[PDB]
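User: For a benchmark we're assembling, each entry needs the component sequences followed by a predicted structure for the full assembly. Here are entry 17's components. Please fill in the structure.
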Amino acid sequence: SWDKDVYPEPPSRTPAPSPQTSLPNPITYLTKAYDLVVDWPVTLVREFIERQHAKNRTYYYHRQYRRVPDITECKEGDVLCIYEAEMQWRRDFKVDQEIMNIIQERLKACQQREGENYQQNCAKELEQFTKVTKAYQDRYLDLGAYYSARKCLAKQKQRMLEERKAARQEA
Amino acid sequence: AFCAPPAYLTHQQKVLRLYKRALRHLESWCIHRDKYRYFACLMRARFEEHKNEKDMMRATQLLREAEEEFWQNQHPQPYIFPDSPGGTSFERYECYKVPEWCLDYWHPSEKAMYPDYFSKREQWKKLRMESWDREVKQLQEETSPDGIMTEALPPARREGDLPPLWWHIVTRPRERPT
Amino acid sequence: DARFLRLMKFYLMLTGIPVIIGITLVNIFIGEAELAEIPEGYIPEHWEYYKHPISRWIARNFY
Amino acid sequence: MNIFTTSILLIFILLLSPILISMSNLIKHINFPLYTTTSIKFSFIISLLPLLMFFHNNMEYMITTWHWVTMNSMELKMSFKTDFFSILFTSVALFVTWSIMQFSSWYMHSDPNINRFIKYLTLFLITMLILTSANNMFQLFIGWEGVGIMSFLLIGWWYGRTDANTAALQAILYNRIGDIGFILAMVWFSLNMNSWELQQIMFSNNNDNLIPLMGLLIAATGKSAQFGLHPWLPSAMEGPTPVSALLHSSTMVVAGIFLLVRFHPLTTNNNFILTTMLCLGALTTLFTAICALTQNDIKKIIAFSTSSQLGLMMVTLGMNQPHLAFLHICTHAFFKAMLFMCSGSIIHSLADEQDIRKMGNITKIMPFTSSCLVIGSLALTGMPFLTGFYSKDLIIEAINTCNTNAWALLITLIATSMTAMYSMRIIYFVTMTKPRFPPLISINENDPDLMNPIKRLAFGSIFAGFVISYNIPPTSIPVLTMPWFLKTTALIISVLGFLIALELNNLTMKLSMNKANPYSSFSTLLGFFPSIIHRITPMKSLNLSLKTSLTLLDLIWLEKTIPKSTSTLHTNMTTLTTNQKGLIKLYFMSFLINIILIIILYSINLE
Amino acid sequence: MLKIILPSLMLLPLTWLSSPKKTWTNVTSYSFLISLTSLTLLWQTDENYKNFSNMFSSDPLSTPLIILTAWLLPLMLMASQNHLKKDNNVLQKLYISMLISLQILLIMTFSATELIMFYILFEATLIPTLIIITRWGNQTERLNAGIYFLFYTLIGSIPLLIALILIQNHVGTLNLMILSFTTHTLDASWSNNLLWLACMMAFLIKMPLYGVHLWLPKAHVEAPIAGSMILAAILLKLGSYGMIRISIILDPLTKYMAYPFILLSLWGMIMTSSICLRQTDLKSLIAYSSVSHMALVIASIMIQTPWSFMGATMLMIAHGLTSSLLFCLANSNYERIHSRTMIMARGLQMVFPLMATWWLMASLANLALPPSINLMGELFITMSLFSWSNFTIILMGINIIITGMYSMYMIITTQRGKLTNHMINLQPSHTRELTLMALHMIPLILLTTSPKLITGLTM
Amino acid sequence: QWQEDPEPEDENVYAKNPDFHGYDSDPVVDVWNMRAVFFFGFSIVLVFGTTFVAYVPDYRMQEWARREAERLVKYREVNGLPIMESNYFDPSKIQLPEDD
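Assistant: Structure for entry 17:
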């Protein structure tokens, strides 16, 4: 249904039952009852509905936008090029937010499955989080509520200036 | 509640109310009934001792000294009858004390379920409309021209007349309506 | 007050019940479309990018 | 992954069904109290199954049901955190509410709007379950404020008493002062972590979390009725006693302790917060256990006892023992609610009388209620192998076996003694003396609505601590090797308290005259805290708001400055300009002035 | 946009050419239908805002305000039927025409791409409002109220016109799409600072600020119920919309020219919320609460962060709905006793049990009861400010406390307590006013269910 | 004292028409105004507009952005790339000053 390469979920090595007494487990029998009584009619309703879906089946696609010159390739005052570039930048910005959200979700799920040993076994997700957060910070952070592509560009430029001046110096 | 306090409070009334408050606070201290009976006999002895003191200068001085002593050694959490000021059930039922005129807006459907009651109600309303002017004039004609009033109401001197200003004492909602 | 409540319930249900029922039918029998890849040299109409039948019907006939 | 979640959600579905009916025409015919009681009972039975599956495998879930809104880089969902805490509290609260529902069906048979009462109880229960099963802090805040408003509405059930609306407003005020810290925490976590979820907040463990932790601590102070913000809880006794047994005894007030339990992974690495918890809790315990030693209103005693136990729970949270505090939370509700319900029976029989001075012997005339009340008082005290013991014992052990402030330890032991003391005060002035109540007897405690819930809560108060403490997993490591005079210290304390109170009361039976000693007028009067604060702070607030804010500025000075200065300026310039004399001689003289001015301007500027 | 405006025009001939009896029903129904038609603007399936012409447009910021403005008209019409029942047919038609013109001009203002159309209409919304106030208000302070309302706004707006003309002469166009891509840093200078003042103070007086807010309570107190509703809900949002649109060309002067106004707003929030305690007039209480709430909008817009704009939009929508609701509730009791004092009628839960639930729910939305959208706005504004300076939460929290306090005071001393038995004229609640409260409340539930709509351009 | 009419006497609108809804003194007008209000407000608007909005797809490009973020994280984890570069614009597109 949903991709593992995006929302990975480990295999959940499960331990086998080791009953060591004579009393019955009231959960296995209640569970068989619940299955027979709930999962079967629901599963049947679902079979019927999926069949009615198979009949009159419908399709829908994912909108692919082509690449258009960024604002670097646009001129001061040319509002056409700038409009296209800025709509693109907003698209990519929304996409980057959704990426960061995917990563936060992966982190939450990892921490939950691990449990007490989440400082271990959950440092890869935290590392990816730190990384993408550093990036997001460095490319979208200090812009105001009027964020656009020119502001991101100026921020990138001042950052590269400061770094190039910290590199030229000490050389 | 039903009576209106007078202009000022006499000396005997002051003493009686001090007696009452003292005995109540003493009941509050003396929780057990025998202890209370004993110390109440003592308190009545303390009062009755200066009972025939004729002078007033010393009477008021004793009264004020007693008020001071009462404010001292005064139970901070005295007993308060529940339905009384400061009690648990003081106005607990004042939310169900809907007045009577709320029925003048009832819908004829709501009324058809209680016909006898509303016939009686119209009878009462006619009674009131008839007695109004007579009681008004009874009031205006027997106001002492001295110029000082008393807040108390007169009875229905003439026969066939209803006592003035009765529709709010009568028709008063009950005290535990549910 | 009870009259107002009765009337509000009646006039909401009068259209919300047919709507709910139509939605349940659409989702039981027609349902949602499934993702896919654009066949080469095919231009999907603007409504073939949406998922739900109501959504794309509205989109087609009004947008 | 299916059965568990199915039940966790069906519980809420069941709690909601009564309320959706209340907005329908059925409520006219069907018996709504019985319907709600049945729904609560079935919710409890259903919730028993998650509890079993957790006792078995000790697995806990994170369940995201409905995606509400995605704000850029920050998602909001209705996520549930079914851990030990949430599941056990759900089951316990549902048992207690099942009992309270019957007790109210009996205690409020005379109230016309009783269905509204049941609906409000159920709404509070739903809000509490939300506040208890929430993985997100917005959902926690929802439950928080919902509990607050439900308290306001239930305390103010009798909206003719100007003394009940006061208490409701009081509670609102204090719990909003706590909301301030709660919101501080939310803000800090939204900026420094970007998520209100706990799974993402947990990675702040290696950071400096003093600000949000102080926010949470202020919120707990406000809700659990700690010292600076205690008064609202007893004042809440203006409401019907089922409200007091449900909200202001067992579940609502417990929300602060529960919250600080839910964030214990962050307090373990901060000692400032632990020590302030310790001090606040010990001080509350002492102060309230004191104030209860001279109160004659049974409800107020049962409430100060609750405040003391909350202080003790906060102490527990101070020495890094959250699981113990939650176990005490779960074991306390049983006997505390049974205590409130015994009080409510006694009050309904004696015609609203709540003052122990007019109660007298209750053994002879209410043996069943009296036995249940004694069981409750015992469980409140140690009384080994009842529900209270299985927590309070380990509480006392942990406090007397850790590097703790000595004053806190001392006053906690003193407060356990005082617990025994006022428990015995109740048992004496209500169960062992001779009558003081009116001579007409209209006593009846045979109605099955009164007896079945009380005896269920009694079975609880007796066996539930054993059951739980044996079914739970081992969370912490208890110190089990200490001198005799520390493992037997809680029992010694309670016994000495019993004996001392017994002697003091057998003495007040004598014929000497009691007096107003200054050390009791301090207890009888809540330590003067209300008497001075509740009329000095509102005085300043409400006099400032008028004098300095409304009149001085808005009605006087802004008006004088801007509009009523512009107006005066322009009307004066008008009087100047237009008040001429109608003489052409003067007009022409002015025309000459203008001629000359123009000629001069020209001459100097250009020539 | 024409499909929303031309029907709003034809409403006028429908008002005048209609029989005296069927004039209210027709206009009310067709206004509801127009509110419906306005729901197409929510069909935004992309990040590309809707431009319908060189003049009319609608972004995620203007669409909620337009829908609210189209939805408030029928509610005002309804609320305005108990009074005017004894007025002549022509007067009723004139009132309805005033309201329709207000609707139309506001939809235009929110749809305008250019700032000169926005200004012309921003100012045209003074004529019908002033007429409503001074012609159908009841007391004599009508006139001073209208005067204040006119001249605060005009003295603020004139500099705005001068600044717009200056920007025109410097840039070539006052279009909002062009002024956003073709932008330049404003050199820090006293001239550009005065330009900032000119561009801002008109809106700041319309939000309003704390120092200049006396025109609002006078109006609300002396305005009929419809005027109060539209004013509180829309004619204040007007200033915030203007500031949000015009603050792009004032960068970065907004970084240091804001402290005065952020500060005045944060402090006047406390001052006004405190006034709302020692206030005898219910309408004045509602007005001062509105000021306390708009202070947050001003501060948020001043710091201009995404969370800030979002919270501001949510708070605008929610406050409009709930304040219109509270004024409706107050006028309900006013029509019975004809007094605005909150102390006279103080047991109304024993006669109007259902109408009290409206009081309760509103006062809960007035304060921030979650998951209300009145709360999400306050919360995100608090967060933005905390990020701004961590010492704002002090004032924010004491404001929260005072807010709970005076809302509870309102509902307690108005509904709860002992009934005033001499008030024999407390007729039961009208189905119409009950529908009014329902129509004000249900949309709050629905928005709380779907908040993605009222976020704004930032989200 | 100059001439005017005296302040009138308040009226109980339910007196003559107990089945009064608050709209008009004439009953028929009252009932039909009530019905039109209820219909066009609840049955029409609050229902059909609510549905129209609930079935608006991809509101402000929200589902599409999610799908594309999935596509991109997949591609970039499968091709070694990182999930987000600290620079939006390729520096080759950028010519920084020749500061001296």
